[PDB]
Structures are given as structure tokens and as C-alpha cells.
Amino acid sequence: QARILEADAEILRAYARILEAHAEILRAQ
Amino acid sequence: QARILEADAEILRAYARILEAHAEILRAQ
Amino acid sequence: QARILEADAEILRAYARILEAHAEILRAQ
Amino acid sequence: QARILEADAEILRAYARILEAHAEILRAQ
Amino acid sequence: QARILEADAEILRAYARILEAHAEILRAQ
Amino acid sequence: QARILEADAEILRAYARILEAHAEILRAQ
Amino acid sequence: QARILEADAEILRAYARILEAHAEILRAQ
Amino acid sequence: QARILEADAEILRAYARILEAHAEILRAQ
Amino acid sequence: QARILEADAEILRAYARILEAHAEILRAQ
Amino acid sequence: QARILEADAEILRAYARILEAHAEILRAQ
Amino acid sequence: QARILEADAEILRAYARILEAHAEILRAQ
Amino acid sequence: QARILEADAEILRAYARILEAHAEILRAQ
Amino acid sequence: QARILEADAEILRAYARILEAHAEILRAQ
Amino acid sequence: QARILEADAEILRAYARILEAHAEILRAQ
Amino acid sequence: QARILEADAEILRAYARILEAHAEILRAQ
Amino acid sequence: QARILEADAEILRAYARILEAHAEILRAQ
Amino acid sequence: QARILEADAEILRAYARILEAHAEILRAQ
Amino acid sequence: QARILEADAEILRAYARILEAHAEILRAQ
Amino acid sequence: QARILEADAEILRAYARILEAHAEILRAQ
Lengths: 29, 29, 29, 29, 29, 29, 29, 29, 29, 29, 29, 29, 29, 29, 29, 29, 29, 29, 29
Description:
The structure is a homo-oligomer of 19 chains of 29-residue chains. Chain A contains one helix and no strands.
């Protein structure tokens, strides 16, 4: 179970990492 | 499983590495 | 799998290496 | 595969080597 | 392949060798 | 169309970049 | 069009670069 | 156009280079 | 134009070269 | 023009050469 | 009294130092 | 007392030193 | 006590020394 | 105790010495 | 113990000696 | 007037510089 | 007046220089 | 006045020079 | 006054010279 609890959650966090970056860019732009 | 948990996640992090750089550039520019 | 996990990710990191340099330049400039 | 993983990545690193130099110059200048 | 991986990369490194020298000069100057 | 959607919007964002800076200054001041 | 989209926007970003510096100074001061 | 886009922007960046230095000094001081 | 774009910018960079040195000194001091 | 662009800039660089030396001394001291 | 006021409080602050780090990690992840 | 106030606290700070490093890595990765 | 306060803490710091290096590598890579 | 405190720590530092070198190489490369 | 503390550590340092050389070469190259 | 407007204000800013440092310390601690 | 405006302010900045160092230490520690 | 403005400030800067060194050590350690 | 301003400050700088060396050693070690 918890093995892929990491799978599930961790990936999502990365997804957000990307979006956050995108936002940062819009601020600077 | 976790073998490619790295695959999945790690790549995404690199994607963000690039975007972050892009932002940095906009600040300096 | 992981063999080309390096392929994928490592290249991206280099891509960023370049962009980062570009930023540095803008600061000095 | 990994044979030309070097190809790909290594060249990029050199590209950056050049840019970095360029920056250094701007500082001194 | 790798034969001209040297070609590609090695030349670039020399290019940088020159630029680096140029910078050094600006410092002394 | 979208070509100059960038034109329109992107410029405005820069306008704001400036104002934001102005605010930051008032805080420090 | 986009040619001078750079003109327009890029200059503004530099304007802000200056102001930001000004703020930084006030903090240190 | 873009010829003097460099003119415009590049000079401003140098202006900031100076101010940034000024700040650095205040920190050390 | 660009001929004296160098004039303008390059001199400023030197101005900063000096200030930076000044800072370095304050650190050591 | 560029003739005395050297005049201007080059002298300044020497000015900095001196200051840098001064710093070095403070470190050793 | 105040001698171990430091004891008490200072340790707690370190406890938080750790948690904060943990959070930072989750963001990057 | 305070003798081992150092013991307690100082160790914790090191614990955090490690975690912080871990985070840094995730950013680069 | 403090004798092995060094033991405890100092080792941890080295652990971090290693991780930090690892990060540095990821940046260059 | 402290006798092998050196053992423990000192070795780790060497481990890092190696990694650091590895990084340096990636920069030049 | 410490007898082979030298063994362990000293060898590693040599390992690094080699890598460092390798880097130096890449710079010149 | 403005001569000592600097007097007044600038000193206060330094006062704050100190307090800010104090805070930073509490975070790390 | 301004003569000792330097007196006043400059000293304070040094005071902060020290505190800042103190903080840095706590991070590493 | 300013004669001993140097006295005051300059000494403090040295005090910090020492602390900074101390920090550096903790990093390496 | 300034006679022993040297006394005071200069000695401290030497103190730091020593510590810095100590750090350097830890890196190599």
C-alpha cells in the first residue's frame, strides 16, 4: 500500500512544482 | 513500481528546473 | 528503464545549464 | 543508447562552457 | 559516433580556452 | 490574433512589474 | 509586430531592474 | 529597430550593475 | 550607433568594476 | 571615438587593478 | 531561572528548525 | 545545565543541516 | 559529555558535506 | 572514543573530496 | 585502528588526486 | 533641511538593519 | 552634520555585520 | 571625529572577519 | 590613536588568517 502511496502523491507534487514555476514566470514577465 | 516512480517524478523535476531558469532570465532581462 | 531514465533527465539538466548561463550573462551585462 | 547519451549531453555542457566564459568577460570588462 | 563526439566537443572546449584567455587579459589590463 | 494577444497582455504585465517595484521601495523606505 | 513586442516589453523590464536595485539599497542602508 | 533595442536596454542593465554594487558595499560596510 | 553603444556601456561596466573592488576590500578589512 | 573609448575604459581598469591588490593585502595581513 | 529559560526555549526553536526543513522538502518534492 | 544545552540543541541543528541538504538536492534534480 | 558532543555532531556535519556535494553535481550535470 | 571520531569523520571527508572532484569535472566538460 | 585509518583515507585522497588531474586536462583541452 | 532628512531617516534604517539581523538569528537558532 | 552622519550610521552597519555572521554560524552548526 | 570613526568601525569589521571564518570551518567540518 | 588602531585591527586579521587556514585543511582532508 504505502509503497505506492508515495507513487501517487509524490508525482502529484511534481505536477504542482511545474505549475508553480509557470506562475513565477508570469510575475516576472 | 518504485523503480519507475523515480522515472516519472524525476523527469518532471527536471522539466521544472528548466522553467525556473526561464523565470530567472526574465528577472535579469 | 532506468538506463534511459538517465537519458531523459540528464539531457534536460544540461538544457537548463545553458539557460542558467544565459541569465548570468544578463546580470553582468 | 548511453553511448550517445554522452554525445547529446556532453556537447551541451561545452556549449555552456562557452557561455560561461562570455559572462566572465562581461564582469571584467 | 563517439569518434566525432570528440570532434564536436573538443573543438568547443578550445573555443572557450580562447575566451577565457581574453577575460584574463581584461583583468590585468 | 493570439500573436498580438501576447503583445497586449505581456506589455501590461511589465507595467505592473514596475509598479510592484515601486511599492517594494516604499516599504523599505 | 512581435519584433517590437520585444522592444516594448524588454525595455520595461530593465526599468524595473533598476528600481529593484534601488529597493535593495534601502534595505541595506 | 532591434539594433537600438540593444542600445536602450543594454545600457540600462549597466546602470543597474552599478547600483547593485553600491548595495553590496552597504552590506559589507 | 552600436559603435558608441560600446562606448556608453563598456565604460559603465568599468565603473562598477571599481565599486566591486571597493566592496571586496570592506569584507577583508 | 573608439580611440578614446580605450582611453576612458582602460584607465579605469587599471584603477581597479590597484584596489584589488589592496584587498589581497588585507587578506594576508 | 533565565539560565534554563534558554534551555527550554532554545531547544524548542531547534525542533521547529527541523520541521521547517521537512516542509521545504515537500515543496521541492 | 547549559553544558548539555549545547548537547541537545547543537545536535538538532545538525539534523536539520542534513535535511536542508536533502531539499537542495530535490531542487537541482 | 561534550567530548562526544563533538562525536555526535561532527559526524553529522560530514554526512551533510557529502550530500551537499551530491547537489552540486546535479547542478553541473 | 575521539580516536575513532577521527576515523569516522575523516573518512567521510575524503569521500566528499572525491565527489567534489567529480563535479568540477562536469563543469569543465 | 588509526594505523588503517591512514590506509582508508590516504588511498581515497589519491583517488581524488587522479580525478582532479582529469579535470585540469579538460580545461586545457 | 533635506541634508538632515538623510540624517534622521538613514540612521533609523540602520537601527532596523540590526533588528532584522536579530530575527534572522532567532530563526536559525 | 553629515560628517558624523557617517559616524552614527556606519558604525551601526558594522554592528549588524557581526550579528549576521552569528546567524550564518547557527545555520552551519 | 572621523579619525576614530575608522577606529570604531574598522575594528568591528575585523571582529566579523573572524566569525565568518568560524562559519566557513563549520561548513567544511 | 591610529597608531594602535593598527595594533588592534591588524592582530585580529592575523587571527583570522589562521582560522582560514584551518578551514582549508578541512576541505582537503
